[PDB]
Amino acid sequence: MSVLSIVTVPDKRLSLCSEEVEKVDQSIRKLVDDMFETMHANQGLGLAAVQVGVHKRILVMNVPEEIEGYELYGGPYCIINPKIVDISQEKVKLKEGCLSVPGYFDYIVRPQRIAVQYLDYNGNECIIKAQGWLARCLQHEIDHLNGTVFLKYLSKFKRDFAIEKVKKKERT
Amino acid sequence: MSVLSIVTVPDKRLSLCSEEVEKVDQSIRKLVDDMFETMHANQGLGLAAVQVGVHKRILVMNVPEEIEGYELYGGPYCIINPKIVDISQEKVKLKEGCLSVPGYFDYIVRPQRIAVQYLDYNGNECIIKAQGWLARCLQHEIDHLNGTVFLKYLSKFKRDFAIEKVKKKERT
Numbered sequence: 001m002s003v004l005s006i007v008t009v010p011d012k013r014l015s016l017c018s019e020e021v022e023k024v025d026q027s028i029r030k031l032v033d034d035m036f037e038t039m040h041a042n043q044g045l046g047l048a049a050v051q052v053g054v055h056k057r058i059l060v061m062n063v064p065e066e067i068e069g070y071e072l073y074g075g076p077y078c079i080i081n082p083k084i085v086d087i088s089q090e091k092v093k094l095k096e097g098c099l100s101v102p103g104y105f106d107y108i109v110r111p112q113r114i115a116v117q118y119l120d121y122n123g124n125e126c127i128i129k130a131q132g133w134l135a136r137c138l139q140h141e142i143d144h145l146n147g148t149v150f151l152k153y154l155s156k157f158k159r160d161f162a163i164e165k166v167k168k169k170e171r172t
Numbered sequence: 173m174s175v176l177s178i179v180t181v182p183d184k185r186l187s188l189c190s191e192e193v194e195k196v197d198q199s200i201r202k203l204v205d206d207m208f209e210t211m212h213a214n215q216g217l218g219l220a221a222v223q224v225g226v227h228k229r230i231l232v233m234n235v236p237e238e239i240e241g242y243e244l245y246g247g248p249y250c251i252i253n254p255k256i257v258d259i260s261q262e263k264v265k266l267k268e269g270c271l272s273v274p275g276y277f278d279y280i281v282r283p284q285r286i287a288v289q290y291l292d293y294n295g296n297e298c299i300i301k302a303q304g305w306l307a308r309c310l311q312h313e314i315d316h317l318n319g320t321v322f323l324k325y326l327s328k329f330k331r332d333f334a335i336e337k338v339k340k341k342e343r344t
């Protein structure tokens with residue numbers, strides 16, 4: 001299991017929608033394994049396949065301990081072909097960063113709770129009922145699968161400032 | 173010297189531009205005195221006259237200790253009829269709240285350094301050269317004089333969320 005390079009803004013791969021996984025087979029499991037290693041090496045709570053250059057609907061999460069039926073933390077989760085099955089109308093503001101926008105943090109308003117159907121590492125059907133930071137991570141990761149980085153939720157001026165910040169740090 | 177009530181969003185008084193002070197006289201000094209007391213009672217770093225219902229170009233600041241020629245902190249400052257005379261092209265992201273949007277904090281990008289000409293408590297001409305939190309406060313206060321609250325710099329979705337948050341807290 002190996003550490004993959006993270007794709008960072010403004011790389012256009014990050015704005016491309018990822019495709020459903022046809023079949024959860026050995027090759028998918030190998031990628032998931034590399035995703036977990038990469039997530040850990042980067043001190044992340046989650047990671048989407050697109051962030052390592054693969055446009056497939058696969059994300060991993062692990063949210064450490066620090067509504068009945070919902071989880072505040074947990075993992076490791078392998079979440080393939082996620083489908084949102086319930087989502088709270090109540091929303092909360094929390095601070096986020098992203099491995100694809102290194103060093104930049106800002107506030108984002110999202111639903112507090114979410115339920116998602118998915119296929120696991122073995123290709124079995126599952127539901128996750130998440131709240132708190134678990135729900136927050138899951139939504140951030142699902143957005144990546146749809147070609148969305150969290151800067152999309154900010155003013156244009158701040159989004160541009162964040163992208164210029166990352167560009168300046170990567171200029172050769 | 174008395175504590176004045178703070179005008180909060182979405183009160184439309186906060187979106188009205190304030191008028192130049194004609195003359196810094198006893199009545200202006202009395203208002204400034206009440207502004208300092210109100211600022212302190214509310215644990216603020218600054219305050220604009222519009223926030224206490226008076227549409228005049230007067231702000232106060234006091235930024236405690238915690239470029240050559242620029243100050244990182246200081247006060248108490250009485251700043252009347254401010255005019256920006258220099259402003260840095262470099263900008264910085266810092267977290268702000270506002271007494272007129274109670275309980276809501278977010279990130280704002282602003283110039284790091286500013287120089288402002290103004291009239292003081294005695295009606296004498298002065299310049300302030302500010303950086304760090306002093307410059308940050310001064311710009312936040314100047315915005316109020318122009319009818320601008322810091323939510324203006326946010327996404328519409330987050331601005332609306334903040335205003336609904338304050339409205340819900342004030343609903344009778």
Ligand SMILES: CCCCC[C@H](CC(=O)NO)C(=O)N[C@H](C(=O)N1CCC[C@H]1CO)C(C)C
Nearest residue numbers: 044045046047095096097098099100136137140
């Ligand atoms: C919170 C919503 C998203 C979490 C997932 C991201 C990782 C990522 O970009 N996944 O796509 C992360 O770990 N971000 C971290 C992050 O945002 N954290 C970690 C602690 C809490 C929160 C910052 O408030 C750091 C590494 C930037």
Ligand SMILES: CCCCC[C@H](CC(=O)NO)C(=O)N[C@H](C(=O)N1CCC[C@H]1CO)C(C)C
Nearest residue numbers: 216217218219267268269270271272308309312
């Ligand atoms: C920082 C830019 C503006 C400072 C002035 C405001 C007060 C205000 O609304 N003036 O118009 C303030 O004191 N805000 C505080 C504030 O934003 N602070 C105080 C410590 C640092 C910073 C939060 O990061 C709290 C009381 C909400």
Ligand SMILES: [Cl-]
Nearest residue numbers: 103104105265
């Ligand atoms: Cl920053």
Ligand SMILES: [Cl-]
Nearest residue numbers: 093275276277
């Ligand atoms: Cl909030």
Ligand SMILES: [Cl-]
Nearest residue numbers: 154155326327
């Ligand atoms: Cl924003």
Ligand SMILES: [Zn+2]
Nearest residue numbers: 097098099100
């Ligand atoms: Zn991310």
Ligand SMILES: [Zn+2]
Nearest residue numbers: 269270271272
């Ligand atoms: Zn304010």
